[PDB]
Design a protein around this ligand. Structure first.
Ligand code: CA
Ligand code: CA
Ligand code: CA
Ligand code: CA
Ligand code: FE
Ligand code: FE
Lengths: 354, 353
DNA sequence: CGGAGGCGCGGCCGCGCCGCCG
DNA sequence: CGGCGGCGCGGCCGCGCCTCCG
């Protein structure tokens, strides 16, 4: 029922979408997303028990879902540049240059940036775990330590010393799972090395069994617990003058799983290709949730990220929905808590003999 | 720097408890808390890589702390009964029977409950994962599924069919860690079987180096993330008329780590052996945080849980402190965000030749 | 109704930043 | 002004409940 969906960036379950490059990435063991970003060959960062498992496919409530399972699978600079526009308040057709932070060591691009600042072209450099390293805000007696997945830097000048106008934050959350992939990885790895035709073997019942061997479901409530807190906290930090906006990038599958956690919220249609969660018409701290898909239309080797839903969020609404609205629905007339007393009595009754 | 604090329920780092009972439980691999709760010999439920590591000792901000790392180490029926009195509204000195749900199978205790009920004595049966299994509430379109660590059934009737007046909820939280215990466990496991006099070997430099082998620190923020959500949600659920109250039981160490998460809060002294987090005069959700210690006074082999701090919480204040007050402190003067713009530029300048 | 699978729960794992000590 | 190390972060792990499907 549960399947490894992508193996080193390339589809294996729903379709075995494999070109010549797909054969190579899997044989060498290379995450194509780190390689394309850094322009240097890079193997997946994961331990042997889950090596190359970038996406897992499962059903919840009788519907199929791709679950991103590696933060590096959502390492799509092109998508992040687009989401950046919404954070810094740029138009859709505005000149923008989105470069990595390690590139700043190169003279050729430092001379290039200066020319862009003269033209009025926006220059944003990003700091990411494997591309420059993350940035952190230190703990206090009244505040905990925090780290940002993507720190965006809007450049003002770099003439003598690099200086920024504003900064941006993108937070990525994928999904973690129950159990292990060890058995599914182990079974498909022997068909990779010892086997003579791997891609022709994956769509077969034997390969489909191997891709699913002891594969379990997603840790749904776990990521909501961890991501909700970071949302509420980091969105409040976005209200700082020098912070242009904070956005959380999450897959469609993850967004849908959060709906019950948010008391089944109705999104407001703004008529601007964007949606809103609560009243964002006043005193806004430019808080965003970018719900993305794995592009089902591209045909290109690794499916890139495509926008699915762009939600501007009211923080107090987000807090109120999760911690007040949802419990009240659980305390509803036909809800689970109404019948709980009978459940306790039923569970007690099981210990009675005969 | 970081040490295994106790092995199979008996202290090993700060002081080595060297009783015959401490030697026996270690050599036989029994978690002494499960075997005492259901009166049947039971080994630790943990996997080989962390087997027996029921507590870990670490320093944060230059002071020592014991981190419980096994929910079964907090399995203390004696402590939970005292905490339940606060939940159901019993005085400190009034009759109370606190029994595990599995025992309901016995006809001797079933008749015993009937005898207690008609003499006004309170009877509460508890459901815990290893003792009767946990109770859960199922998901809806507007609410997620939840499980309760301890669900407490205040019995009123047994004769025809078991029936309860109210239910109570106790949630238990300890601590998870970074890295592995594997290397420290494997270093002392070979000392247990292949060597002689295990306790005498533990306090030596070589032993203390073994107890600390690649031992890392507590996963502090992780635990707050997971538990805060359960607090806010389950405390709101406690408002239900059939729910007497819900309490969260945590070690002192983890409560101290929560202070920065709660904008450094100041507890209001009620002058009744109880403190309050916010205004708890009106509308009572009957929500509690029971902060406990590993009893340092009594020198029994496994040191039981002793009350350290008994807190009434205003749920709305708990949410406010963590999600509004704390972020505002971080944005304040001399805060980390104030100097963040310079940090970006400094990190940006590190690429310059 | 009985075995299989979903998933809350909560402890294992290591990367890489930054604070602390010498 | 360098290297141990604390710790945020976020993905691995399996227990035992319950709901679903044959
Ligand atoms: Ca991060
Ligand atoms: Ca995140
Ligand atoms: Ca708990
Ligand atoms: Ca539990
Ligand atoms: Fe990957
Ligand atoms: Fe244990």
């Amino acid at each position: 029922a549960n399947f490894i969906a992508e193996f080193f960036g390339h589809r294996v379950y729903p379709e075995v979408v494999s070109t010549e490059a797909a054969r190579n990435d899997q044989a060498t063991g290379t995450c194509p997303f780190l390689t394309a970003a850094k322009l240097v060959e890079t193997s997946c960062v994961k331990a042997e028990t889950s090596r190359g498992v970038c996406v897992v496919n499962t059903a919840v409530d009788n519907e199929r879902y791709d679950w991103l399972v590696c933060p590096n699978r959502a390492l799509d600079p092109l998508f992040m540049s687009a989401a950046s526009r919404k954070l810094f308040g740029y138009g859709p057709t505005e000149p923008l240059q989105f470069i990595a932070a390690p590139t700043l060591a190169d003279q050729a691009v430092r001379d290039g940036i200066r020319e862009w600042l003269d033209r009025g072209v926006h220059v944003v450099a990003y700091f990411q775990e494997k591309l420059g390293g993350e940035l952190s805000i230190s703990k206090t007696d009244s505040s905990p330590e925090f780290s940002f997945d993507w720190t965006l830097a809007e450049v003002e000048s770099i003439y003598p010393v690099p200086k920024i106008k504003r900064y941006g934050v993108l937070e990525i959350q994928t999904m973690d799972f129950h159990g292990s992939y060890k058995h599914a990885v182990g079974a498909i790895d022997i068909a990779l090395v010892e086997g003579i035709d791997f891609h022709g073997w994956l769509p077969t019942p034997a390969g489909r069994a191997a891709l699913s061997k002891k594969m379990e479901g997603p840790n749904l409530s776990n990521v909501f617990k961890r991501t909700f807190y970071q949302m509420a906290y980091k969105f409040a930090l976005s209200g700082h003058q020098r912070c242009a906006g904070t956005g959380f990038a999450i897959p469609q599958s993850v967004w849908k799983s959060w709906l019950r956690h948010l008391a089944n919220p109705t999104l407001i249609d703004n008529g601007d290709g964007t949606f809103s969660l609560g009243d964002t018409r006043n005193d806004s701290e430019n808080a965003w949730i970018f719900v993305f898909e794995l592009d089902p239309d591209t045909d290109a080797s690794p499916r890139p990220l495509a926008p699915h839903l762009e939600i501007r969020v009211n923080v107090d609404t987000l807090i109120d929905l999760a911690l007040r609205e949802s419990p009240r629905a659980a305390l509803g007339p036909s809800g689970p808590v109404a019948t709980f007393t009978d459940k306790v009595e039923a569970r007690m009754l099981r210990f009675w003999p005969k």
